Amino acid sequence: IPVTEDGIEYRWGNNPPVRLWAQLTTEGKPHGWPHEIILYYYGLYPAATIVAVSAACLAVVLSLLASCYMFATARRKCLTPYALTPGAVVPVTLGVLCCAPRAHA
Amino acid sequence: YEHTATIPNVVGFPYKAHIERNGFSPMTLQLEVLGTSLEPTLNLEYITCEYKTVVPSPYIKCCGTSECRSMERPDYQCQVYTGVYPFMWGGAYCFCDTENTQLSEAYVDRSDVCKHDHAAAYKAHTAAMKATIRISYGNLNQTTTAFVNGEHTVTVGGSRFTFGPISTAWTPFDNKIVVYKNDVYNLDFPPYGSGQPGRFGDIQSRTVESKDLYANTALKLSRPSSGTVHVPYTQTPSGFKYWIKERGTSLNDKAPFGCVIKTNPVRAENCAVGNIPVSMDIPDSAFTRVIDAPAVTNLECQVAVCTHSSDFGGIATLTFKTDKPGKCAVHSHSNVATIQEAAVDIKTDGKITLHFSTASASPAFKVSVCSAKTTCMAACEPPKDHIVPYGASHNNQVFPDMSGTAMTWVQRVAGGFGGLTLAAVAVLILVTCVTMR
Numbered sequence: 128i129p130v131t132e133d134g135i136e137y138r139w140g141n142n143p144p145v146r147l148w149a150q151l152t153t154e155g156k157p158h159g160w161p162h163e164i165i166l167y168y169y170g171l172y173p174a175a176t177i178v179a180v181s182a183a184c185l186a187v188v189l190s191l192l193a194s195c196y197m198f199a200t201a202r203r204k205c206l207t208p209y210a211l212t213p214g215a216v217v218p219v220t221l222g223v224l225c226c227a228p229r230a231h232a
Numbered sequence: 233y234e235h236t237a238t239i240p241n242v243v244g245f246p247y248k249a250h251i252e253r254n255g256f257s258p259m260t261l262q263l264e265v266l267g268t269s270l271e272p273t274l275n276l277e278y279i280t281c282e283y284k285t286v287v288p289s290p291y292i293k294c295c296g297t298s299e300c301r302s303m304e305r306p307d308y309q310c311q312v313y314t315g316v317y318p319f320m321w322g323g324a325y326c327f328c329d330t331e332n333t334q335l336s337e338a339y340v341d342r343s344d345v346c347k348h349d350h351a352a353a354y355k356a357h358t359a360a361m362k363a364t365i366r367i368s369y370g371n372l373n374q375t376t377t378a379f380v381n382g383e384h385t386v387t388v389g390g391s392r393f394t395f396g397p398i399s400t401a402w403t404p405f406d407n408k409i410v411v412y413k414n415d416v417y418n419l420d421f422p423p424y425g426s427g428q429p430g431r432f433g434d435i436q437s438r439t440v441e442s443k444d445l446y447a448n449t450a451l452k453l454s455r456p457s458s459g460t461v462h463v464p465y466t467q468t469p470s471g472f473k474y475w476i477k478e479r480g481t482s483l484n485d486k487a488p489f490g491c492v493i494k495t496n497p498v499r500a501e502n503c504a505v506g507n508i509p510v511s512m513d514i515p516d517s518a519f520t521r522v523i524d525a526p527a528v529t530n531l532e533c534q535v536a537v538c539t540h541s542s543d544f545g546g547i548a549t550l551t552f553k554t555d556k557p558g559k560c561a562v563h564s565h566s567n568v569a570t571i572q573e574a575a576v577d578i579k580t581d582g583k584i585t586l587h588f589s590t591a592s593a594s595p596a597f598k599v600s601v602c603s604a605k606t607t608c609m610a611a612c613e614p615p616k617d618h619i620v621p622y623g624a625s626h627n628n629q630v631f632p633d634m635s636g637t638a639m640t641w642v643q644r645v646a647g648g649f650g651g652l653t654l655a656a657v658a659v660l661i662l663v664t665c666v667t668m669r
């Protein structure tokens with residue numbers, strides 16, 4: 128039979144009713160290394176916790192992609208004009224790897 | 233001094249209510265719910281029972297002349313037969329053959345055990361709920377009985393209590409019900425107009441006064457054979473017996489909140505739903521002034537173990553300087569964790585022990601001593617791992633503290649990942665402002 132945090136009754140023959148409900152139980156260390164906190168938080172309330180993990184992962188990847196795109200746009204607006212002009216080079220001393228416009232010579 | 237509070241409607245669950253009027257030492261109230269019940273309104277539409285097929289002795293008349301009549305008692309079947317030649321142990325009686333009159337009549341009536349073995353039907357309506365409450369405070373401990381309706385009082389002493397309207401009404405009863413020998417069912421019965429011959433309430437007679445015994449049991453007579461005397465008829469079996477035989481799965485095992493049902497005033501007892509409000513007025517003579525038991529000084533807390541969620545695992549120690557010994561009320565301000573012990577005395581040593589309980593893993597409750605209050609957080613790791621044979625003693629709200637000590641690093645790594653984007657935005661703004669010129 129299943130049992131949850133609400134309660135389960137008994138009627139086996141003519142015995143008086145018996146009332147039981149489940150504990151909070153679960154396994155894993157709840158104040159330890161990162162790869163048991165998720166296990167503890169997942170064993171209790173199995174639903175909506177993997178949803179939380181997925182949402183956190185989505186936020187992290189969105190942040191990483193946004194930072195990368197902003198850096199790329201900043202680099203382009205930084206030193207696209209030096210790719211223009213007839214000939215010419217990068218100042219190097221003013222900037223060589225701070226904006227990283229390295230493309231042969 | 234009126235005060236308001238709300239209590240979950242759970243039997244066998246202590247409740248704490250701390251009164252903190254200024255100019256006096258704050259005190260606590262212990263609330264206990266002891267067997268609340270609920271009672272609906274009844275209407276007693278009609279009654280059902282078995283039927284007796286009253287059939288008198290058959291009428292043989294040896295002249296051949298017909299004789300038909302019809303009185304007003306229920307469901308006569310006026311049938312007359314001709315050309316019958318009955319037999320009898322004396323060989324035969326009379327002489328004329330093929331010219332005889334058989335008059336056979338029958339009807340239905342109630343049974344002898346209709347007074348006892350009958351079943352009743354009722355209609356649901358607005359329902360009022362009993363509430364037996366135990367109240368205690370300093371040197372006072374008393375039970376009472378209220379209505380938890382819009383208005384009622386208790387007057388346990390100089391103080392009065394009013395239990396406001398119920399939060400909701402998820403009554404197990406609904407529309408129409410059937411009551412029969414310490415049991416009820418949510419079975420829709422046919423109306424008083426008519427009923428199918430055999431389903432249920434084939435007799436839909438009214439109250440036990442036995443007036444206008446309606447019946448639709450579909451009698452039908454038949455022509456007797458030539459062998460001997462007969463009274464043949466066709467009669468479907470009583471639907472009351474079939475309904476008793478099938479029965480099954482009474483409403484006692486169908487309450488959507490485990491609400492044990494009784495039958496004397498057709499009541500349902502010991503079920504939890506919603507919460508009950510309360511407003512109490514306490515006289516000024518029920519407590520001492522602030523000149524008694526000043527125990528503020530400084531104050532710090534420590535936690536030994538927090539084996540939580542079962543009965544009480546939060547063993548906490550409180551240390552503080554204080555004046556002369558005396559009583560001191562204690563409670564918890566936040567509802568994350570709750571304590572058991574009411575007002576507790578203080579000795580000159582200044583060390584006391586408390587037993588709290590919670591459902592989370594990083595509680596951040598604020599234990600308040602009868603005049604002071606301090607923050608108190610615990611490292612509540614150990615999850616008890618069994619299945620409990622008794623009730624719960626805490627709120628079901630579980631959530632780690634926003635500051636806490638468990639998920640701090642998760643919050644800080646998320647903040648760092650956001651900070652990289654913030655720095656990227658800032659450097660982009662700087663670059664675009666520089667290149668705009």
Ligand SMILES: *[C@@H]1O[C@H](CO)[C@@H](O)[C@H](O)[C@H]1NC(C)=O
Nearest residue numbers: 262366368372373374375574
């Ligand atoms: C109130 O009195 C009853 C008397 O039987 C007792 O069982 C109960 O424990 C008392 N209440 C408290 C809080 O001690």
